[PDB]
Amino acid sequence: YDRGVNTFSPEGRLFQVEYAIEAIKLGSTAIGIQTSEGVCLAVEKRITSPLMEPSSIEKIVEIDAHIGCAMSGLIADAKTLIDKARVETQNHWFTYNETMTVESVTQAVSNLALQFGEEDADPGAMSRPFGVALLFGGVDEKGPQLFHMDPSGTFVQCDARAIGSASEGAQSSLQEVYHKSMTLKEAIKSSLIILKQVMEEKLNATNIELATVQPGQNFHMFTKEELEEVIKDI
Amino acid sequence: LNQMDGFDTLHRVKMIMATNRPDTLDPALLRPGRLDRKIHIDLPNEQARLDILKIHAGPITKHGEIDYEAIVKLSDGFNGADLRNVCTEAGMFAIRADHDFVVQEDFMKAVRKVADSKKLESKLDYKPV
Amino acid sequence: FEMARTKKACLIFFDEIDAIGGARFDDGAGGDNEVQRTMLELINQLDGFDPRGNIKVLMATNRPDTLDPALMRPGRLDRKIEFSLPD
Amino acid sequence: GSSAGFDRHITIFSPEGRLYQVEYAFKAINQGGLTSVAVRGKDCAVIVTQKKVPDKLLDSSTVTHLFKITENIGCVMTGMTADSRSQVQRARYEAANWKYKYGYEIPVDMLCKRIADISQVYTQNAEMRPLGCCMILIGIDEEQGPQVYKCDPAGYYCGFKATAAGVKQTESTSFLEKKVKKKFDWTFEQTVETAITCLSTVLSIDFKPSEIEVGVVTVENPKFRILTEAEIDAHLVALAER
Amino acid sequence: KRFDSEKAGDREVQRTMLELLNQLDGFQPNTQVKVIAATNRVDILDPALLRSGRLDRKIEFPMPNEEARARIMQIHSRKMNVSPDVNYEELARCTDDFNGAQCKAVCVEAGMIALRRGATELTHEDYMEGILEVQAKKKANLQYYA
Amino acid sequence: NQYDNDVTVWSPQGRIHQIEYAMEAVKQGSATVGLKSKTHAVLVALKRAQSELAAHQKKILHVDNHIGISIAGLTADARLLCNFMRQECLDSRFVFDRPLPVSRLVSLIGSKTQIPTQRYGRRPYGVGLLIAGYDDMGPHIFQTCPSANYFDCRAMSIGARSQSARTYLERHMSEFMECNLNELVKHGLRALRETLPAEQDLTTKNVSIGIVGKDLEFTIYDDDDVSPFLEGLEERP
Amino acid sequence: TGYDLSASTFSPDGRVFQVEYAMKAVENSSTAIGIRCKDGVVFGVEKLVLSKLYEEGSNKRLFNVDRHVGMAVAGLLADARSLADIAREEASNFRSNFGYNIPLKHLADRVAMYVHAYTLYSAVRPFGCSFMLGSYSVNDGAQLYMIDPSGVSYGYWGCAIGKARQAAKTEIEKLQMKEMTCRDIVKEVAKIIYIVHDEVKDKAFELELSWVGELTNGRHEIVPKDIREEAEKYAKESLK
Amino acid sequence: SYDRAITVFSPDGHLFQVEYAQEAVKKGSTAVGVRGRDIVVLGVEKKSVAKLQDERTVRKICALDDNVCMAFAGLTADARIVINRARVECQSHRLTVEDPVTVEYITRYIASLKQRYTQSNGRRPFGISALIVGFDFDGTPRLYQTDPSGTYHAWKANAIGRGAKSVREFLEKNYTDEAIETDDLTIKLVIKALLEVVQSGGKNIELAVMRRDQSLKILNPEEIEKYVAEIEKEKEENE
Amino acid sequence: GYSFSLTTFSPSGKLVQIEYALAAVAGGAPSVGIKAANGVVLATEKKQKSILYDERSVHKVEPITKHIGLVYSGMGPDYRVLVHRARKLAQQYYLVYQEPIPTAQLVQRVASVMQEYTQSGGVRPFGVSLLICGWNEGRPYLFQSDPSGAYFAWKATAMGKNYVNGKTFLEKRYNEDLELEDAIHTAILTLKESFEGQMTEDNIEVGICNEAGFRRLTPTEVKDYLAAIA
Amino acid sequence: SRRYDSRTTIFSPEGRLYQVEYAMEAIGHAGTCLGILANDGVLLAAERRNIHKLLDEVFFSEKIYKLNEDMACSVAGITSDANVLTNELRLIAIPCEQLVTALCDIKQAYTQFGGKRPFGVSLLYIGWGFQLYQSDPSGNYGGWKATCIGNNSAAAVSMLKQDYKEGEMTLKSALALAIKVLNKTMDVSKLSAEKVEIATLTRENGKTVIRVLKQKEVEQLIKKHEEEEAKAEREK
């Protein structure tokens, strides 16, 4: 249309940034909880057909052995952000021989957001914002940390953040169940309780993903047997 | 049109027609058989602007030398009504300052004040086709 | 407005005001000149030399960006209630 | 006068085959309100234009539409003042480049033929507007003699025995056409006189020796010089006495 | 403004205007009637109407500045029970690009808020929040800024 | 309208709406207060939280050992600007081995921000910066606008409801010069209180303070470190 | 109508509205006057303070594009600063190439072409500031050039740019600027600024003064505070 | 260079150019792929079969590598660029890792290539969707589907094209472990799925198969006609 | 610069901007080209709107090589750009082959330039049609390059104003046995039907090509040919 | 910039490329071009629209172009765009399908990125086994035994769909078929040799021969067909 990508609304809003924020509400619901024992990441696969293999829907991605990311919105757009995160990490390791902090990893991915333009831009520069919200979760010097990223490039640490279609409903339920001093098992259980209530389908060990990053331990993808153990309760 | 130039010849009857938008007139009306002459009352030139100023600034009470030429240089693009406004506004500055006379300075502001008012006027150069 | 003024209190609803409420413009020809005069008269009645009366007008449009600035001014349209998409 | 699309906003053809944007650049020459007259004689070429100084605050020594493109070539600019300087600066660069690349002074005909080539690109590419200025170069050729060339915003160019540009271009053209019809190889004095008379008669000003600028090139001295107020007054005195 | 057209035009309205051009300054000089004219778009008006004999003075009405805006809100708050703590200077600084009507609407809207919360006196916060309604800013979730 | 879709289109009133639209992004941001004394220049910021389960967005960022800023507006644009001023301050040390003067830095970001407001397809930096720094010329408080126009201010507040803080800063601007560090910070906290609603109060969670002085490096204070400053001020009437 | 949305489109009357609209920004700013006297040029800018919070010296409309050339701006300040840097880099390049201080006529003719280059294409917008360049040298003499957003540079004896330019010009014409010196002009420049200031309108202005002349050895410097206060007192007394 | 944002967010949060590209896929010929036990099957409807058309040149089933082949649905010209781009990367991966490309990798690259065209200046999205089939190095059959947005999923059986919704509904009900017990049964499942939208019959069915440790094999029309008779014969005994 | 094509296909499958460019050609000065047995003639109406114009300053018939000539109908400035490009193209052919460029080869190279401006970004098509005449292999050549970039080999054609009736006039007045001098006579006759006023030696421009090469006829020569008309 | 951009390389709401479709309409108004595959050669019959009697006949063919020693092509649509494609076609040249695919990648490129208008040319390719190819501005290419592009292409394809006996055709049968198909497609009831353009490609002595039939040879084909058509009139 007549409007460019880098255009400001009369209310001070970047039009394309706000529009990309609306794209997250069409994505699957992802729940991340920060706990002193670790960070739990939950997301719904949203199976649309019995023939589709649930294993192919990877909505929780290993950024590194100590940090994982949960995605919501446009999954195809998050691959570029994830690849840069997995490239920025192992670049800090190459130069400083240490694992990058979760805040720094989120900050590096955040700088990729808003680097979109129509004119006076590089040939490889993007044209539109990344219509995906990321939920970075991992352990570092500051212990377990959960960070939420939005298509606006604004990243902030969150004790318990829910993103996606049911972000409004799940966040309200998260506040009713989150306390600072709890265990990771409660955080995993509470996330599955909230997810089960917001999913269109019925919760089972094949239509969801659960990830935990514990201190000492590495990023871990919950298997079907592990998922069935916690689902069998609620 | 049938009376200016039609079947019955017009004798000893003359027509004077005035318009600031002759471009919109009908070609038949502008035809030389009806409007033989198209007298162009153009905007005043440097000498014409000077003449109009003395006509309108004549009855104005004034002391001191009045440099009409200085007004003319800043009056470029003015019409006859603008030059009368310069005389009117010059007295308005005298009345504003409680004066019974108009000085060249009062004229200097008046010609400048009217000049700002000419920025609101659209295209004036319209000619018969 | 003459008939609305013959009553103690009145309400006038202008559904789809953008049909006549478009912003004034000069496109060389007489583009929407007649309709603009209708908007100008409506603007005059809402807030002009004479008091409007006890009329409270109500305008509804899906294209408020096309409305004339003088019509979108307090004293003619004091409240701008936005019917955004429901949450 | 049909239109279809952006034919009035960018330099693209109208349905009847017209470039309105280029045409609008011609009306931009009249925005300055000044008229220039150039007359070519048997051994001289003269450019005459009116200089308007609305206030005494302006330095009249700076308000000049006469520009020395090179030593042997001069021009008079009509139209937007800002666009005029760019063309003059562009013309000076091309004249200097021609001298460096080819070893001899650029001919008057080839100077605008280059300038008209630059201004033609403005009428073909749509990301820039045509320069709303008119260029009239005068200079003494080695063999052809005195030369006058008008150089319009459209990229058109032609030689002229006597031309004019500005608000009163067509009024002055009719006057110069009448004088040329008499078929007189005017001397240097006559060319200045007919150039001043052409601007004087059309404008009806009865010029003072501070209201016009005269730039002459002659075969005896193939260099472009601006006539001073003392020199310009001699011709005006001669005009009055006859 | 009058225009030249071949198919259609508003020749009737231009005839009415041309009659007004006579009355302002025509064959019979009418120097005993004073004429006031008001318009929003002086660029639309015919050049013959904006002549220096028909409309001699063309007064430009500017957007009220910081000092004027405080004066305007004070003018329309006279018949209003306003507490002696309202900082009209602060309100004027918060009403950039406001015309007189919006400044008046701020006082009118502030009365709505005082009635909304039941207060019998208008406070500075009522004026402050009434500016937002007059500003008519679209709803946004711009809480991620800063 | 048709004059508000691009930053290279002049409105008939001699205004650029895209520049003014970008200026409203600062007004959407949270309030920050920057004031200075004869020897100190402090920044007081009111962090905002999207939800009570999320942290408060950081508002004061460390640019150089002597220069510190408080952002207001698009966080991504602030990082782009803050990185630029960090690099320019670093480049001065690498070349001249001297701290970059604050006045000579804001000029650079005033020219860096001016380029996008003039070229087609670019947008103004939708962030407002309150720059505090100390150099040979004393403490400084610079306010950066998306219009690429900067002001050398004695005390400025930008953000949402910042004009309430501008009133307090104007009233007590006379006592800013001779007051010590503790009194200077309290003035900014008191000024930042004016931007809050009646029921809200300054707490350690939503207050950040940055201090740069003659012999003091630029240090940012947080929830634990705001307590030595917050307890001094009394409750507002 | 679409004829005014770009600098690369001509109006049917052959006028570039985007350049004309950019000129309106200059007419919305405070007036800045400059008078060329016998032995120099004195610059006076009426610099309002929008609030008491800004320090004395903020929004300096008087720049130093070279050691001998000043700059008084009016309009959008960001483009004024950008053009000041363009004028600064033009003077630096001239010295780094030809080996001497750049003449004002060439500097004005060079910066104006940069200003004019922004009035031709839709990819860029015309500069929203008009500025006056003043310089003094023993050889060339006092010079004063004003460059508008369109790119027109003309030498001046007394020039005013801003919203009160028309009223300021009338006060300049009274002066016999061709005979008096800088020390006498600085009093009058203050007087003209104080006269054209509107106290009922936008008020609380700071008088910014600068000059370049034989009394400064051809160096553009801010007028000393001691002389500046004397000029301020004379201007205030002239208002009765 | 043309640097313009073709794909931009709609106010609702949708990429319309992506959605419009997906509409072009819905106008293409129906392509059906079924992943069996020891064989992977691709079935493509041949739309209209002109007797003067060289069936060799118009082929919607193409082999990216010796172990990976895909069938597309959408703009024929757009698909060939993707196939050639994937074919080039198939050889680049082979020269680097000294191992044939996995079905995930070539699907990931094609999907990433698709997404790059939905977020690059001056480029419109690819208007094709691909049904990538093949065998990994461990012999596991794999079937993948990509869409113009750039998303990829693994499917036991899937359909793309104009009749995708009806066939996928058919595949949801008939895809069982018994139905993929043998290679012939896996072949018959595709024809049954294709015959739900193909009207004339086996004449408008182009079927290609790939077996483990074997190259892509295109079924001749007589073989397809032989299979169609079996389904027709089996239809009678079930009545 | 704009990187998007300003010429696009209409819904009815026409490059509309090309058609408008051809309208500019139809409003230009008439140009007539006749290919005789022993040569080709190029004639055009070089009539000015006043006597102040120097007739010999700007020539509508310009040589490209020693044996190729141009004459146009359309926009004057656009023809000078194509003249330089054609002369540049002829030099490029001459440098690499050391042989004067064939008339047919030059038309393809020039038409390719014209075609580029139909598809290139931010540009409009040339508003001229180029009549190209030349002599190669002992055989006369005459070509027409439209704004679209399509080139036609013409035995006798007319362009510009009143070209439809000029083409009809050439239909009944041209035969393959015509000689160079009679072709000049026929070319002047074709102009005369579209000409208004009287044709002098200065208001028309004639150029011919033969074995001796292409040369533009001097005003003295054109006067002698014009005398045979009356 | 954005205001003047027509956005040629974008998707319509129905998933269509409007510029590609509009270019395909231009070919429909172009001259008729035929192509018939036989067991011993391929022919390319193209309708000549440059049939003005003052048009000189200097070129070997008007719409028939030789790409390489083994290949010939004919175009329909914007003739200027055809020169660009034919000049590029020779630069790439090799197998017949390889040449068509390479050019069609160029044509598809203009429909995806660049912002320029598509090449409104549909080409028919003949080369040596023997194969006939058709290309569209979208870059979609396909082999054909008998196909037609241009004016009344749909009518000509219907005639070929009925009268092209697959496999059992030599040049003479294919050449006679081309004239008969062209007769109905053309509005001219006579279809003289000056309105048609036939080029035949054959393999001789191990070399590919691309020869344009002379006007005398074509008149025999027209004469033979009209007598053959008149022979059917004897039946009725």
Short mmCIF file of N, CA and C in Angstrom, two decimals, chain I residues 62-124:
data_model
loop_
_atom_site.label_atom_id
_atom_site.label_comp_id
_atom_site.label_asym_id
_atom_site.label_seq_id
_atom_site.Cartn_x
_atom_site.Cartn_y
_atom_site.Cartn_z
N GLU I 62 20.60 13.45 -39.30
CA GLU I 62 21.97 13.39 -38.82
C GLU I 62 22.64 12.09 -39.24
N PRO I 63 23.90 12.14 -39.68
CA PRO I 63 24.61 10.91 -40.03
C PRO I 63 25.06 10.15 -38.80
N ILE I 64 25.13 8.83 -38.94
CA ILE I 64 25.61 7.94 -37.90
C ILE I 64 27.00 7.42 -38.22
N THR I 65 27.18 6.88 -39.42
CA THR I 65 28.49 6.52 -39.95
C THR I 65 28.66 7.20 -41.29
N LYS I 66 29.69 6.81 -42.05
CA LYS I 66 29.86 7.35 -43.38
C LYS I 66 28.79 6.88 -44.35
N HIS I 67 27.93 5.94 -43.94
CA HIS I 67 26.95 5.35 -44.83
C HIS I 67 25.58 5.14 -44.20
N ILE I 68 25.35 5.60 -42.97
CA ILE I 68 24.08 5.42 -42.28
C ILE I 68 23.57 6.78 -41.83
N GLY I 69 22.28 7.03 -42.02
CA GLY I 69 21.69 8.30 -41.63
C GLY I 69 20.41 8.10 -40.84
N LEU I 70 20.09 9.11 -40.03
CA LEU I 70 18.90 9.12 -39.20
C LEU I 70 18.00 10.29 -39.55
N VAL I 71 16.70 10.05 -39.42
CA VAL I 71 15.68 11.09 -39.42
C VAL I 71 14.51 10.58 -38.60
N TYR I 72 13.88 11.47 -37.84
CA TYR I 72 12.93 11.06 -36.82
C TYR I 72 11.59 11.78 -36.99
N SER I 73 10.65 11.38 -36.13
CA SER I 73 9.37 12.05 -36.00
C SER I 73 8.90 11.83 -34.57
N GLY I 74 8.87 12.90 -33.78
CA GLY I 74 8.51 12.79 -32.38
C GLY I 74 9.13 13.88 -31.55
N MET I 75 9.77 13.51 -30.44
CA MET I 75 10.36 14.48 -29.53
C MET I 75 11.81 14.73 -29.91
N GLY I 76 12.15 16.00 -30.13
CA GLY I 76 13.48 16.38 -30.54
C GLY I 76 14.58 15.96 -29.59
N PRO I 77 14.44 16.30 -28.30
CA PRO I 77 15.49 15.89 -27.34
C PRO I 77 15.70 14.39 -27.26
N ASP I 78 14.64 13.60 -27.38
CA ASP I 78 14.79 12.15 -27.32
C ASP I 78 15.60 11.62 -28.50
N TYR I 79 15.52 12.29 -29.65
CA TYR I 79 16.23 11.83 -30.84
C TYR I 79 17.73 12.06 -30.71
N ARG I 80 18.13 13.14 -30.04
CA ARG I 80 19.56 13.39 -29.84
C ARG I 80 20.20 12.34 -28.95
N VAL I 81 19.46 11.86 -27.94
CA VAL I 81 19.97 10.79 -27.10
C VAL I 81 20.17 9.52 -27.92
N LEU I 82 19.20 9.19 -28.78
CA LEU I 82 19.32 8.01 -29.61
C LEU I 82 20.38 8.18 -30.70
N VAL I 83 20.63 9.42 -31.12
CA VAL I 83 21.70 9.67 -32.08
C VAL I 83 23.05 9.36 -31.47
N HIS I 84 23.28 9.82 -30.24
CA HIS I 84 24.55 9.54 -29.57
C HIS I 84 24.72 8.06 -29.29
N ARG I 85 23.65 7.40 -28.83
CA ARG I 85 23.72 5.96 -28.56
C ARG I 85 24.03 5.19 -29.83
N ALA I 86 23.36 5.54 -30.94
CA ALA I 86 23.63 4.87 -32.20
C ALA I 86 25.05 5.12 -32.67
N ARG I 87 25.53 6.36 -32.54
CA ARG I 87 26.91 6.66 -32.90
C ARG I 87 27.89 5.94 -31.99
N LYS I 88 27.58 5.87 -30.69
CA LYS I 88 28.39 5.06 -29.78
C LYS I 88 28.35 3.60 -30.18
N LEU I 89 27.17 3.08 -30.52
CA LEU I 89 27.04 1.68 -30.91
C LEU I 89 27.80 1.39 -32.20
N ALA I 90 27.76 2.32 -33.16
CA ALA I 90 28.50 2.13 -34.40
C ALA I 90 30.01 2.07 -34.15
N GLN I 91 30.51 2.91 -33.25
CA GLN I 91 31.93 2.87 -32.91
C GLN I 91 32.30 1.56 -32.24
N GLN I 92 31.44 1.04 -31.36
CA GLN I 92 31.72 -0.24 -30.72
C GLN I 92 31.79 -1.36 -31.74
N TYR I 93 30.89 -1.36 -32.73
CA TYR I 93 30.97 -2.34 -33.80
C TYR I 93 32.24 -2.15 -34.62
N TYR I 94 32.58 -0.90 -34.93
CA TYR I 94 33.76 -0.64 -35.75
C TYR I 94 35.04 -1.04 -35.04
N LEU I 95 35.12 -0.80 -33.73
CA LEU I 95 36.35 -1.09 -33.01
C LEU I 95 36.65 -2.59 -32.98
N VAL I 96 35.62 -3.42 -32.84
CA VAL I 96 35.86 -4.84 -32.61
C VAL I 96 35.90 -5.62 -33.92
N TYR I 97 35.26 -5.09 -34.97
CA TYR I 97 35.28 -5.75 -36.27
C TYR I 97 36.08 -5.01 -37.33
N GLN I 98 36.46 -3.76 -37.08
CA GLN I 98 37.23 -2.96 -38.04
C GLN I 98 36.54 -2.92 -39.40
N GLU I 99 35.22 -2.76 -39.37
CA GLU I 99 34.38 -2.72 -40.55
C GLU I 99 33.18 -1.86 -40.21
N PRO I 100 32.75 -0.98 -41.12
CA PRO I 100 31.59 -0.14 -40.82
C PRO I 100 30.35 -0.98 -40.54
N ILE I 101 29.57 -0.53 -39.57
CA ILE I 101 28.48 -1.36 -39.03
C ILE I 101 27.38 -1.50 -40.07
N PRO I 102 26.86 -2.70 -40.32
CA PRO I 102 25.78 -2.85 -41.29
C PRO I 102 24.54 -2.09 -40.85
N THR I 103 23.77 -1.63 -41.83
CA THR I 103 22.57 -0.86 -41.52
C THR I 103 21.59 -1.69 -40.70
N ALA I 104 21.39 -2.95 -41.08
CA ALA I 104 20.48 -3.81 -40.33
C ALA I 104 20.96 -4.01 -38.90
N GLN I 105 22.26 -4.24 -38.73
CA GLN I 105 22.81 -4.47 -37.39
C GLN I 105 22.62 -3.26 -36.49
N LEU I 106 22.79 -2.06 -37.03
CA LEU I 106 22.61 -0.85 -36.23
C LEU I 106 21.18 -0.72 -35.74
N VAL I 107 20.21 -1.06 -36.59
CA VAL I 107 18.81 -0.93 -36.20
C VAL I 107 18.49 -1.85 -35.02
N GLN I 108 19.00 -3.08 -35.05
CA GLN I 108 18.78 -3.99 -33.93
C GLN I 108 19.39 -3.45 -32.65
N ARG I 109 20.60 -2.90 -32.73
CA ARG I 109 21.25 -2.35 -31.54
C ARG I 109 20.50 -1.13 -31.03
N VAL I 110 20.03 -0.27 -31.93
CA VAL I 110 19.31 0.93 -31.51
C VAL I 110 17.94 0.55 -30.95
N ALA I 111 17.24 -0.38 -31.61
CA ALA I 111 15.94 -0.81 -31.12
C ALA I 111 16.05 -1.50 -29.77
N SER I 112 17.17 -2.18 -29.52
CA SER I 112 17.37 -2.79 -28.21
C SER I 112 17.45 -1.73 -27.12
N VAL I 113 18.10 -0.60 -27.41
CA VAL I 113 18.13 0.51 -26.46
C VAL I 113 16.73 1.04 -26.22
N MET I 114 15.94 1.20 -27.29
CA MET I 114 14.57 1.67 -27.15
C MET I 114 13.73 0.68 -26.37
N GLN I 115 13.93 -0.61 -26.60
CA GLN I 115 13.18 -1.63 -25.86
C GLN I 115 13.54 -1.60 -24.38
N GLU I 116 14.81 -1.35 -24.06
CA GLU I 116 15.23 -1.33 -22.66
C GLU I 116 14.44 -0.30 -21.87
N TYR I 117 14.21 0.88 -22.45
CA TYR I 117 13.49 1.92 -21.73
C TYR I 117 12.01 1.61 -21.56
N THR I 118 11.49 0.62 -22.27
CA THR I 118 10.15 0.10 -22.03
C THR I 118 10.09 -0.80 -20.81
N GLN I 119 11.18 -1.47 -20.46
CA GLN I 119 11.15 -2.46 -19.39
C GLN I 119 11.96 -1.98 -18.19
N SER I 120 12.90 -1.06 -18.41
CA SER I 120 13.75 -0.59 -17.33
C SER I 120 12.94 0.22 -16.32
N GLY I 121 13.49 0.34 -15.12
CA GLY I 121 12.79 0.99 -14.02
C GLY I 121 12.92 2.50 -14.05
N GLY I 122 11.82 3.17 -13.71
CA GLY I 122 11.84 4.61 -13.53
C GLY I 122 12.05 5.42 -14.78
N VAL I 123 11.80 4.85 -15.96
CA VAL I 123 12.01 5.55 -17.22
C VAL I 123 10.79 5.37 -18.10
N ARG I 124 10.63 6.29 -19.04
CA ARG I 124 9.57 6.28 -20.03
C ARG I 124 10.14 5.95 -21.40
#
